[PDB]
């Protein structure tokens, strides 16, 4: 959120939080790439791109 300046993607539930921790233990960059699709503004932009 502080890096890409995206204020969406606030938090996750217990399962998602723990399994995100597991992924970070495996690879933080996978977490970075996976987080992108939670950004609502990203969805707005890609819907505009499709339009």
């Amino acid at each position: 959120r502080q890096e890409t300046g995206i204020d969406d993607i606030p938090d996750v539930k217990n399962d998602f939080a723990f399994m995100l921790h597991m992924i970070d233990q495996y690879d933080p960059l996978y977490s970075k790439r996976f987080a992108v699709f939670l950004s609502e503004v990203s969805e707005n932009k890609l819907k505009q791109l499709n339009l």
Binding site: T4, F34, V36, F37, E43, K45, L46, K47, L49, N50
Partner: protein
């Protein structure tokens, strides 16, 4: 002055009685315990109820990481994948 049959009988009897059971079963015992370890590790994926969630998460994370549009946003067909992403986020929450 003991024939061979007597010697074999003595071996059998004293082997069953005198020798302790732990020495008689240690390899099988260790094998059992390592099987228990392997099975308890594998049951995390052999349980279908959570296995479905795990496999779906693997697929969705692989697709999302593979998407170049994600990196573009960091700076097309992923629009349909946004719906899968939101559905997974809601359901597995």
């Amino acid at each position: 002055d003991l024939d061979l049959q007597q010697y074999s009988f003595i071996n059998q009897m004293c082997y069953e009685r005198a020798l302790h059971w732990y020495a008689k079963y240690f390899p099988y015992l260790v094998l059992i315990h390592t099987l228990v370890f392997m099975l308890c590790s594998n049951f995390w994926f052999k349980f279908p109820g959570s296995s479905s969630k795990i496999e779906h998460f693997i697929s969705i994370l692989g697709k999302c990481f593979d998407s170049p549009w994600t990196t573009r946003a960091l700076s097309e067909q992923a629009k349909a994948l946004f719906e899968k992403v939101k559905k997974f986020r809601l359901h597995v929450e």
